[PDB]
Specification:
hydrolase, about 325 residues, EC 3.4.23.22, about 5% helix, 7-stranded mixed sheet, 6-stranded mixed beta barrel, about 45% strand, zymogen, 2 domains, Endothiapepsin
Length: about 325
């Protein structure tokens, strides 16, 4: 089998991407944030504290003839940005772009933190990291991809995120028309439960490539590109007036600037992030100070190749017995 679904930016800045997901019988379609940095599929639901719901589409398991309470199971998750959610668990039929998994764990939110409430466009998350990070207790549950794997034509999914435009998540096949040149594959460590890999270095604008190992994760659920302070300082030094602002919480730059590109290495290959991808607009409405899309990972504890990086590439998440990652230009 295969699946193919369009993923759409939630706003003009590409702050996140939503993908329609069919849950239950009859189908209830929710727009989920596909997140290769976590491993829980959770949704706003009929069980979510009413004051914590503001515009989201909810899953109502009592209206699904295929929903079954997973007795005794609970979940609770916290994300790198400080947000969180928790609740109980059903199993139900879940379909993504024509690909169907029966008995998928659908984690029903009873509580969500304010950042989720405040985002009316995201109805939940669909985790695509390794199932070892799944938070369901006392019986850990498998991701959608993990459940689908055996049935897929090939045990892979691909992320093709758009810049200020829709893109595509595919399951079970590589669309050879979706990228240019070749796909370069690179090793993955699953030891932390992430799609963790090592970039071979970077360049700023038209500058020379610096060969240096950068360990990080491919995370579609993180907006920005988080890299070591040395690398990030080298980038923003090429932007007149750019500075790290503690009050804002990262690098800002004059909105009148033309940003340089940023290149990262995948083995001997190179992915170029155009400068415009690194502009996340005024820090506040009407400001002439703009927020940077490349930020320091210092204090996160890990480097994160988030959407800013991934949307410059066609990315293969290869879930073979020994997982790997592939990157192609597009």
């Amino acid at each position: 089998s295969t699946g193919s679904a369009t993923t759409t930016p939630i706003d003009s800045l590409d702050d996140a991407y939503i993908t329609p997901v069919q849950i239950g019988t009859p189908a209830q379609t929710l727009n989920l944030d596909f997140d290769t940095g976590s491993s829980d599929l959770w949704v706003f639901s009929s069980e979510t504290t009413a004051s914590e719901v503001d515009g989201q589409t909810i899953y109502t398991p009592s209206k699904s003839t295929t929903a079954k309470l997973l007795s005794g199971a609970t979940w609770s998750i916290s994300y790198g940005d400080g947000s969180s959610s928790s609740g109980d668990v059903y199993t139900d039929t879940v379909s993504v772009g024509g690909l169907t998994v029966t008995g998928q764990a659908v984690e029903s939110a009873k509580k969500v933190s304010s950042s989720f409430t405040e985002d009316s466009t995201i109805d939940g998350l669909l985790g695509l990291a390794f199932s070892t990070l799944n938070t369901v207790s006392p019986t850990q549950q498998k991701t959608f991809f993990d459940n689908a794997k055996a049935s897929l034509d090939s045990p892979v999914f691909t992320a093709d995120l758009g810049y200020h435009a829709p893109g595509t998540y595919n399951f079970g096949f590589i669309d050879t028309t979706a990228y240019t040149g070749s796909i370069t594959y690179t090793a993955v460590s699953t030891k932390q439960g992430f799609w963790e890999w090592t970039s071979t270095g970077y360049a700023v604008g038209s500058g020379t490539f610096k060969s240096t190992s950068i360990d990080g994760i491919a995370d579609t659920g993180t907006t920005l590109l988080y890299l070591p302070a040395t690398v990030v300082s080298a980038y923003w030094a090429q932007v007149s007036g750019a500075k790290s602002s503690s009050s804002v919480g990262g690098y800002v730059f004059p909105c009148s600037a033309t940003l340089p590109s940023f290149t990262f290495g995948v083995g001997s290959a190179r992915i170029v992030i155009p400068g415009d991808y690194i502009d996340f607009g005024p820090i506040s409405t009407g400001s002439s100070s703009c927020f940077g899309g490349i930020q320091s990972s210092a204090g996160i504890g890990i480097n994160i190749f988030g959407d800013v990086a991934l949307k410059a590439a066609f990315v293969v998440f290869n879930g073979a017995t020994t997982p790997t990652l592939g990157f192609a230009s597009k």
